[PDB]
Design a protein around this ligand. Structure first.
Ligand SMILES: *[C@@H]1O[C@H](CO)[C@@H](O[C@@H]2O[C@H](CO)[C@@H](O[C@@H]3O[C@H](CO)[C@@H](O)[C@H](O[C@H]4O[C@H](CO)[C@@H](O)[C@H](O)[C@@H]4O)[C@@H]3O)[C@H](O)[C@H]2NC(C)=O)[C@H](O)[C@H]1NC(C)=O
Ligand SMILES: *[C@@H]1O[C@H](CO)[C@@H](O[C@@H]2O[C@H](CO)[C@@H](O[C@@H]3O[C@H](CO)[C@@H](O)[C@H](O)[C@@H]3O)[C@H](O)[C@H]2NC(C)=O)[C@H](O)[C@H]1NC(C)=O
Ligand code: NA
Ligand code: NA
Ligand code: NA
Lengths: 165, 160
């Protein structure tokens, strides 16, 4: 069976610097994870069983709130992939959205990110929400992570490890 | 073995409405496709062998050119996934980048989980509407090494 996972972010009413919580199963027992992949609620980490080349993906869906007027609050919002252990290039493994007056709107922001990464057996992956917002009083209340525009995180095994290497 | 492909776009010196050409192997003879996948140069299509649920992805890398200056050129650039037969999801399977009068490399990704049939053909159309300056389409390009990509992975076979 293909090794694949697609987790959906638990709701976040406002933005802050925190590790995101994930739904690992839908409204029924059917999990968003295949075998060879586990999700740990306590650590908020996706645990990779076998080593290989994985296609890791992040999809940020920023929903504007009632207080959002679209053209005052600026800065940036990030989804930062937190890997244990660090991968050879795990330096700024992140999906960033820049908010500037130029291109700012009172509209849903839907951005995707991907990277092919060499992961080890027992590799732990968590996702941190990062944001610096300014321009109005209570700027972090102007955006949220909510269902049905759900932020997602996942991966799939592209090439299993070759031990000889 | 996993069913996976990651094709890299052939160079495009300026932006226009066309079906993109793709490299199916790198500089050496190393294939960008696994077994159960083919690329047809003539049709510019990725041919899917077995039916199932595929994670299809597009990644647009727009590189600014020498003539790319100021905050005048605006509009949009798109990568349109052209399926044969039409996938009964939406007729709007596209990556779209909006350009405002704002300049560096634009790197945007798109993905969708799609139910594909045996012999499914997938091609990618480049779409663009640029205005605000005389030869606005010359201000962006698709070039190596910041190469635009297209591929997929079989997530769930129909017949294990
Ligand atoms: C690639 O395909 C896309 C379609 O997917 C295509 O984009 C379309 O381009 C036309 C023009 O080339 C756009 O139409 C414009 O709409 C605005 C709306 O306000 C008008 O102001 C424009 O008209 C001006 O020019 C006229 C002279 O002909 C004057 O009569 C008028 O007063 C205006 O000054 C113009 O009609 C159209 O909106 C887009 N479509 C989309 C969906 O954005 C694109 O041009 C194709 N690219 C290439 C490289 O040819
Ligand atoms: C979440 O973490 C980020 C860091 O990743 C925090 O962003 C940082 O926030 C401070 C203000 O709180 C920014 O400093 C400001 O700089 C400007 C420079 O002109 C100055 O005018 C201000 O007086 C202030 O010192 C800092 O730039 C920013 N860092 C980055 C990298 O953008 C953020 O505050 C944290 N968020 C929460 C919710 O606390
Ligand atoms: Na959302
Ligand atoms: Na094509
Ligand atoms: Na490019």
């Amino acid at each position: 069976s293909p090794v694949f996972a697609k987790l959906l972010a638990k709701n976040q009413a406002s933005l802050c610097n925190t590790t995101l919580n994930w739904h690992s199963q839908d409204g029924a027992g059917s999990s968003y994870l295949s075998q060879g992949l586990r999700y740990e609620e306590d650590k908020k980490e996706l645990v990779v069983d076998s080593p290989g080349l994985y296609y890791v993906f992040l999809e940020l869906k920023l929903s504007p709130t009632f207080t959002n007027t679209g053209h005052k609050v600026q800065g940036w919002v990030s989804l930062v992939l937190q890997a244990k252990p660090q991968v050879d290039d795990f330096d700024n493994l992140a999906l960033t959205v820049e908010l500037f007056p130029c291109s700012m709107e009172n509209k849903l922001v839907d951005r995707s990110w991907s990277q092919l990464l060499l992961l080890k057996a027992g590799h732990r992956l968590s996702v941190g929400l990062r944001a610096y917002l300014h321009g109005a009083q209570d700027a972090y209340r102007d955006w949220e992570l909510s269902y049905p525009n759900t932020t997602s995180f996942g991966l799939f095994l592209v090439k299993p490890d070759n031990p000889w290497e």
